[PDB]
Design a protein around this ligand. Structure first.
Ligand code: 6NT
Ligand code: 6NT
Lengths: 300, 300
């Protein structure tokens, strides 16, 4: 059975997966995505280092391939990350002038979003903006533009494509008692109360064995910020226990504003942490017990 | 135990593999390439659709990543394919003017080769130019420019980087009695007699089970064209029988002008024909029997 179909039958929008051109032309990835998943995200092809490796020199071939494949196969598309220190080329982080950085950031956002205007359901606009203690991470954007870079990014994104749902994303939001989780919720509440157009919080969910249960409490806390949507993104679980995966799915089901879940690849050998076999299909492209456990949960 | 080291000890240049950025950041590919392979090729990142998606506007992010990684890790680099109908964007195949297409082709060759001048051992300049009956394939280049497109491509490439070995590549050159095999020999002999700088013939070797034995006769026939080098490229073998792989390796060893062998990926799940499990490492990144058989053959 298709986990995307089953999650839609439970009132959710999608079960998604990260992919890119050379996954779609190898292995069994295309067949599995066509049958079992409802939304695709670019694993790498929309990051800043992939799309604007030198100023104004945009590289869209990989992203274009993904968008076209998704449209021809009737899949939703997520995009990102527009503003993320981790995939930033050196030409950006060397800028020290506030006006120039504001305009470089705006141009990067606008160019990417305009190119795919109307085709992208979700954009991850700002990623990993928080330190573990809940303060704002001191990236080039914070240091040079100041704390208004987040309002600016979201206002710019809403203008570039008013159809898209605009998300902030972060990791280590998996426990309700962790300071980072409470910090992002209270900042998003205040931003939205001042009119910043943050439509969603996306939780980059990279779990160790046994950590799925904590998401059942963390995700309702993220939803308390009052955004229209929340999502689980980049999901993988070391060991791929059925218990951990089913707990994450049930957290999604329990939270009315949680629109769906995206797993960070199809098959274990193509994972960034392949030795932890953390995905739902094995190296032979066979569904693993965690896949079947999700199916059986969603049927009930 | 490294098949590249062992083939170098037998007097050859390399045992190589095709890869690209998102293979190097996932799985165990980087570790295996570091330990066991001596040359890397771009699986996709130097093809025309990837590098020049609109006229004169070049995308280098993916290819730059691979070249940098190879230099950091002491590996040789192959590049290609500069002129190949199978990865051609639509803007090229809609040109009908001979001068314009000639200039477009020359600019594509010169721009890529200049960017990496001195860093690339081998360039595959022209690919898949022959029909199965040995006539020239009627691609946009043949239809618009005529058969001079092949001489022009090679002369342009030699001027752009005189350090690089320049190859023509084709597939189905695996049997000495197949018409295509003798046809490429006939034409390469004629082009070299006219001063065209074709340094190598690269045989894109996609075998079915039991076809390795025929390479023992086909590869010496390809070498009879008199090029300084020949190579085995894009190698994969359905079923990955040790006998097939060893026969291909011994064909290389038997042909003085054969500089090396490149396999078309690391692990089975990442193959274009993964269901045929045709590579040297399995879906758990373990070396398969064919890998160990190559090790023993190179020591014997
Ligand atoms: O959910 N995702 O797998 C995913 C992948 C890449 C991304 N970049 N930004 N947001 C992303 C989400
Ligand atoms: O040998 N190769 O694997 C390989 C891969 C891609 C290519 N493009 N042109 N030549 C190529 C060789």
């Amino acid at each position: 059975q298709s986990i995307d179909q089953l999650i839609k039958a439970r009132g959710k929008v999608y079960f998604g997966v990260a992919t890119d051109q050379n996954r779609l032309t190898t292995g069994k990835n295309a067949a599995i995505i066509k049958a079992d998943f409802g939304m695709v995200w670019p694993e790498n092809s929309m990051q800043w280092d992939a799309t604007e490796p030198s100023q104004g020199n945009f590289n869209f071939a990989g992203a274009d391939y993904l968008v076209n494949w998704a449209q021809q196969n009737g899949k939703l598309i997520g995009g990102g990350c527009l503003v993320w220190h981790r995939h930033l080329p050196s030409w950006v982080s060397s800028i020290t002038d506030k006006n120039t950085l504001t305009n470089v950031m705006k141009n990067h956002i606008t160019t990417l979003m305009t190119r795919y205007k109307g085709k992208i359901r979700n954009w991850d606009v700002v990623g990993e903006a928080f330190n573990e203690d809940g303060s704002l991470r001191q990236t080039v954007f914070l240091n040079v533009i100041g704390e208004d870079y987040i309002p600016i990014a979201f206002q710019t994104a809403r203008a570039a494509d008013p159809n898209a749902k605009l998300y902030i994303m972060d990791y280590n939001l998996d426990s309700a008692s962790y300071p980072k989780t409470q910090a992002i919720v209270n900042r998003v509440k205040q931003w939205r109360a001042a009119g910043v157009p943050i439509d969603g919080i996306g939780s980059q969910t990279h779990l160790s064995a046994g950590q799925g249960a904590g998401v059942l409490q963390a995700l309702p806390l993220l939803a308390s910020a009052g955004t229209p949507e929340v999502s689980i993104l980049m999901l993988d679980v070391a060991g791929a226990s059925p218990t951990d995966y089913v707990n994450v799915v049930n957290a999604c089901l329990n939270v009315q504003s949680c629109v769906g879940i995206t797993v960070f690849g199809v098959a274990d050998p193509d994972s960034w942490r392949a030795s932890t076999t953390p995905l739902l299909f094995d190296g032979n492209f066979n569904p693993k017990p965690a896949y079947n456990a999700i199916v059986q949960d969603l049927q009930q």
